[PDB]
């Protein structure tokens, strides 16, 4: 929850032991009280300008949550926070050395370093590992 | 002022291929299933309400988060007179889901209540030792 946005990547993994600062917990403690049924204690009393906007607000709260669970769901990394993969890093993506990425770098600058290359990494996890391991697992159950 | 050919795969690109060639392709049909004057909003809920159902049925079967998985439910040869290597090397999926369309309801009941319901009462009572 953005408390370490000026910290470094080699140090922000220390405070990330809290559940991304209880990231998703702020949603459930919100939608317990977003679903205060005073909206149902009125039926909004009409259709109003705000309730049009709240309806377009809750949808984005639904969709953009799902696009982050699905991508974690497909990567063999459902529900975890720090998982490793089988994909080898290609040095053509970034010729930065080891410590400069971790000890000597922010996060948002590192986004603009590989925002070009990000989409290639997405395919190169699924079709390289999570499509792939499931067949090789199923072969190991053939016996 | 752009343009290069295909690299990995396309959307629905394996839908004329065999099963053994489409089984390595499932992620592209898995990603774009969700993302893509009120009548846009009525679409933006049906696209959600279809996604949860397919997500939910994988959840009940002990098979959530995996793309593929196996069970212990036995295949019944009454359902298919097709030989084995004809299925994995000759038949496409679009043809295949016209052939087992009728049996589908029998299948889904015979996954949950057959096994993954039964693999919890057996599972919970492997304690006490």
């Amino acid at each position: 929850f953005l408390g370490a946005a000026g910290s470094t990547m080699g140090a922000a993994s220390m405070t990330l032991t809290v559940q991304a600062r209880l990231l998703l917990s702020g949603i459930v403690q919100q939608q317990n009280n977003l679903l205060r049924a005073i909206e149902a204690q009125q039926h909004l009393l009409q259709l109003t300008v705000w309730g049009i906007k709240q309806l377009q607000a809750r949808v984005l709260a639904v969709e953009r949550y799902l696009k982050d669970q699905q991508l974690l769901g497909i990567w063999g990394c459902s529900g975890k926070l720090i998982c490793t993969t089988a994909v080898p890093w290609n040095t053509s993506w970034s010729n930065k050395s080891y410590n400069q990425i971790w000890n000597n770098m922010t996060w948002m600058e590192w986004e603009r370093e590989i925002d070009n290359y990000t989409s290639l990494i997405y395919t190169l996890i699924e079709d390289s590992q999570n499509q792939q391991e499931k067949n090789e697992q199923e072969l190991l159950e053939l016996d | 002022a752009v343009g290069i050919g295909a690299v990995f795969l396309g959307f629905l690109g394996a839908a004329g291929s065999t099963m053994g060639a489409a089984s390595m392709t499932l992620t592209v049909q898995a990603r774009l299933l969700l993302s893509g004057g009120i009548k846009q909003l009525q679409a933006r809920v049906l696209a959600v309400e279809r996604y949860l159902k397919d997500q939910q049925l994988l959840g009940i079967w002990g098979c959530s988060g995996k793309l593929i998985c196996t069970t212990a439910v036995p295949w019944n040869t009454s359902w298919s007179n097709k030989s084995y290597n004809q299925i994995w090397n000759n038949m496409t999926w679009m043809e295949w889901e016209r052939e087992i369309d009728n049996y589908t309801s029998l299948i889904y009941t015979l996954i949950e209540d057959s096994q993954n319901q039964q693999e919890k009462n057996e599972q919970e009572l492997l304690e006490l030792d």
Partner: antibody
Amino acid sequence: VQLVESGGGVVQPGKSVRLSCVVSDFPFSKYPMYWVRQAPGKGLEWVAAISGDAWHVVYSNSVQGRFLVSRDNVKNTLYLEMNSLKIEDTAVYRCARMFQESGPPRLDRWSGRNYYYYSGMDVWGQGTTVTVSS
Amino acid sequence: IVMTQTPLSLSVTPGQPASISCKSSESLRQSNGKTSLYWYRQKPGQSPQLLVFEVSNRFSGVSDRFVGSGSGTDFTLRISRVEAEDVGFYYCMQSKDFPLTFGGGTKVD
């Protein structure tokens, strides 16, 4: 920066030479290049183009299949090899850099196909000249 | 695609404004949000130099009196108070797709 060529001159029909454009200071693997052909007393004709990673090559239709281009990002060179020469190929060749920077290839999600962006030119080399005659 | 221009010869003297337009067959608007038409100038006996890259922006070492505009098909480069060293040619160059062509080059004396 500095941008010239080499290997120019005059040859016969049916022959084959290769020029050599050399850049000076900018990071050469970052940028794509081009080739242009100004005929004497005429306008300009586009010839060729290479990607920054030397993977994408687009030729003109008239000189299709005959010529050859390549890169060497370490040696910062730029080659235009040519084959099956004709007399109407006698003109001024110029080595030229893209104006903007280019990125890496894009890979649209919906179809597994990359995309190399291509935009026009700012730095024309003064260029050699090849004449095809008897 | 095809893209020619007009007029070929404008033999003038300094002190007056004028304009050179390049006419487009295929309309130009790429999906990035911009129209890839590049206007630039050679001198006689010289490799050319960039006047303006886009029809909006300019380049370094360019006088302020060099203005350009146009629709997706109409395209116009206007030179206010045409300067004494405006000799040579003026090529209109597009960058839609391949093969990317040119104009003939309007001679200005």
